[PDB]
Design a protein around this ligand. Structure first.
Ligand code: HEM
Ligand code: HEM
Ligand code: KPJ
Ligand code: KPJ
Ligand code: H4B
Ligand code: H4B
Ligand code: ZN
Lengths: 416, 410
């Protein structure tokens, strides 16, 4: 690979120079002859051997001690030796609290699909590696939700549960996000609530959940500790902050009966630090408006409200070239931003978020030598080219520490 | 190395085998993806395998692979490369190659039309006047009083690089841009430099906001020469709005004919440095990019003004609101004037159908998601949810250096 790669911004002519890609550790899926950049998941029961672990841990320890300006120091060399001995006698090792916090923040810093990374160094890390049971995981998650929600002044946070050992004792949050609404398939084929969550909702009902069978039922937590069968818990409703959606101009918009939860909290990803694997690491931030207003509400396979809103706006819905869909989509995103700001719940519009991200990316290029970014994910799902990231060339590559996808736990779990 | 592509909205999975036939590079590697980079990084010896590859897929396409005609053509091409260091395509091959360069353009959402392409052979052209005549004929044919027809005009191929045919205009029809004294810009700011070359070469600019630029045509590597396209051949549309009667007062118009004139067509190793090609517009090309890019006509603030929108906070989405009304106007205007145009909903829908057609009959369809997804309302169009594999097949349309950076002025 060449040492310097240039990216251009075609609106501002600004050229940036990337050297950080030389530290790339994993494959992207692309080859010299094919690009897989719009494949969502490009290409087990298998843990790192001693020989796989030694270099992965050294690389991370080296990076950590470089970051604290102690590279080559006595503490650096001693930490290397202690880690090496630990791997040698136990085939794994335990991170220091300092190292865990650094690794978590850097997995966020390295997350190429995240437009909100200007915040990466302001992350509250909750060390839950002493957890042994699902009830304990419930306690940790509740504290996380309460801390991160903060009565609407949201704060980013991650709670990290014990790392993988042999792969038969995994900690998992079976929920894909901590807070989501149930979906219910009807006999007649229609769906009530969130159609994306019909499968998981069915799992919870089989596990014992009594469903309200409404349009916005918060799902219970399904929590697996130490490889045991998962267990159900209801999140105390006073910890689930929600925003009813109204429109500043259209008095009828509240009559739609829409609301959404304030806290986006991903709970199905895997956090990889120095070759260690944290299979339960729920992390949360605050929303960009389009995540709710474009995808959650207007995806055809989700709540799918464009028609109903277009009807109440009295739009001509016979020709697509009237752009009735586009007009309604804007008003829905105006309502979402307006309802969150009125209730003083942190949210960020896609103009402000992408402008912030360009500033972040430029700083990272200057101070770090690059900033991996996935353009397909960074550009918002509406009004793409009137945001600055549309015009920004990006380079995508995989740095470690990192958040990874992992198989859904109901597909792998060995029921006791 | 059968590759699967999924649509996350419909769950349709298609299987790609066609990528096994590519040999040009993408710019990515196993460790770095350059999918959002706009431009990532002959002789007798290089030429015959490239020619043989192209003749092979041609005769494979008419289902006479290994036929007597096929065998004879290969030998004919061999001797011609021997004795002349190049070769000439048959008319059938020229047409096949041009349609297939369009078919293979990963960045084109309009490829469902790929085989309906009128191909104008201009390989006998020798002068800029002849180029002008061929180009006027293309424009007139393609415009067709509003019922636009896809066309391409193919001028003589590159020989030694010192006798290149070039259209110096990036597109056949564009508006001029002028650097104003007070620092601002009149017209189209994307063209300020090309406009200045035309002025330097003798063009008398009217210094308005929608001045159609003259043609600047270079034949056989000579100095380029200026020509005015006859105005009756340049179809234009006044943009107005079905509900906002004040919109016509903005004074906006656009031309009906999108015609790329700065790319290079490669076919069996031959390079056609002048190959103007044209189709019809997707509304967002004018309404989102041309009118609302900050570095282009940049009209958003004005439109939002007349709409009386709250422009103090970005979270009012005033820009998004104005953007939709502008794009409603463009579609409404072209449609009212019976000028062929397609909205991004209909176009992307056609492209998904095209992808399905191509996977079935051809085993795949190279597509660049970054370019295929429209610049507004992305995820309410079906291509947003469609995984695409990008790879480079030949014949192809390639970028080439701008002629003013290479030409030695004679
Ligand atoms: C603090 C405010 C944050 C904002 C505004 C933000 C914004 C976003 C958005 C809009 C996406 C695209 C999501 C989608 O389309 O599904 C995303 C993805 C992502 N974010 Fe951030 N995020 C924030 C916080 C965080 C934090 C705290 C972490 C981790 C510690 C994180 C890690 C990620 C990752 C890994 C992805 C990729 C997810 C995937 O591939 O499914 N983000 N973010
Ligand atoms: C017939 C109607 C057509 C429609 C609606 C259409 C639509 C589009 C659009 C929207 C783009 C993106 C352009 C941009 O953002 O600058 C594009 C790109 C492209 N089109 Fe098509 N197109 C059509 C016809 C054609 C024809 C006739 C050809 C050639 C024979 C062609 C070849 C290409 C190529 C090579 C590109 C890529 C240009 C680049 O990389 O800058 N298209 N098309
Ligand atoms: C920390 C953080 C901040 C922030 N602004 N957004 C996020 C993502 C939030 C999020 C993500 C998903 C998965 C979407 C997946 C599944 C289906 C299609 N997509 C690929 C579901 C949710 F409910 C949700 F809230 C995280
Ligand atoms: C055959 C065909 C059909 C169709 N609907 N559209 C096209 C493209 C039309 C087109 C393209 C450009 C270049 C824009 C530049 C600016 C920066 C990045 N882009 C490369 C200028 C134009 F005036 C123009 F009409 C071709
Ligand atoms: C940086 C990025 O590659 C660049 O802005 C691209 C993005 N996608 C595009 N898509 C289309 N159709 N046309 C364009 O000019 C661009 N520009
Ligand atoms: C097929 C395509 O990769 C898929 O729809 C992607 C496109 N870009 C995205 N971008 C974001 N932020 N979130 C998404 O879910 C997607 N989906
Ligand atoms: Zn790639």
């Amino acid at each position: 690979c060449p040492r310097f790669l240039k990216v251009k911004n075609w609106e501002t002519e600004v050229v940036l120079t990337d050297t950080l890609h030389l530290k790339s550790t994993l494959e992207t899926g692309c080859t010299e002859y094919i690009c897989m950049g719009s494949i969502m998941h490009p290409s087990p029961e298998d843990v790192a051997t001693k020989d796989q672990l030694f270099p992965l841990a050294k690389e991370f320890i080296d990076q950590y001690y470089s970051s604290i300006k102690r590279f080559g120091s006595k503490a650096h060399m001693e930490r290397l030796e202690e880690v090496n001995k630990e791997i040698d006698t136990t085939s794994t090792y335990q991170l220091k609290d300092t190292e865990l916090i650094y690794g978590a923040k850097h997995a966020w810093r390295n997350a190429s699909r995240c437009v909100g990374r200007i915040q990466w160094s302001k992350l509250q890390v909750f060390d839950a590696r002493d957890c042994t049971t699902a009830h304990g995981m419930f306690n940790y998650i509740c504290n996380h939700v309460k801390y991160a929600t903060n009565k609407g002044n949201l704060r980013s946070a991650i709670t990290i549960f014990p790392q993988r050992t042999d792969g038969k004792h995994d900690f998992r949050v079976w929920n894909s996000q901590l807070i989501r609404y149930a979906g219910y398939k009807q006999p007649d084929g229609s769906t009530l609530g969130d159609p994306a969550n019909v499968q998981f909702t069915e799992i919870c009902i089989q596990q014992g959940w009594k469903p309200p069978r409404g349009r916005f039922d918060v799902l219970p937590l399904l929590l697996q500790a130490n490889g045991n069968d998962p267990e159900l818990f209801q999140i105390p409703p006073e910890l689930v902050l929600e925003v009813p959606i109204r429109h500043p101009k259209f008095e009828w918009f509240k009559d739609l009966g829409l609301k959404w939860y304030g806290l986006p909290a991903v709970s199905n990803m895997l956090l990889e630090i120095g070759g260690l694997e944290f299979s339960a690491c729920p992390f949360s931030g605050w929303y960009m408006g389009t995540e709710i207003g474009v995808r959650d509400y207007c995806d055809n396979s989700r709540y799918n409200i464009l028609e109903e809103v277009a009807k109440k706006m009295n739009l001509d819905m016979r020709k697509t070239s009237s752009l009735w869909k586009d007009q309604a989509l804007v008003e829905i995103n105006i309502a979402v931003l307006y309802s969150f700001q009125s209730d003083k719940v942190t949210i960020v519009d896609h103009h402000s978020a992408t402008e912030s991200f360009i500033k972040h990316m430029e700083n990272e290029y200057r101070c770090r030598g690059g900033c991996p970014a996935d353009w397909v994910w960074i550009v918002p799902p509406m009004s793409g080219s009137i945001t600055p990231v549309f015009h920004q060339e990006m380079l995508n590559y995989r740095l470690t520490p990192s958040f990874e996808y992992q198989p859904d736990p109901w597909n792998t779990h060995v029921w006791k």
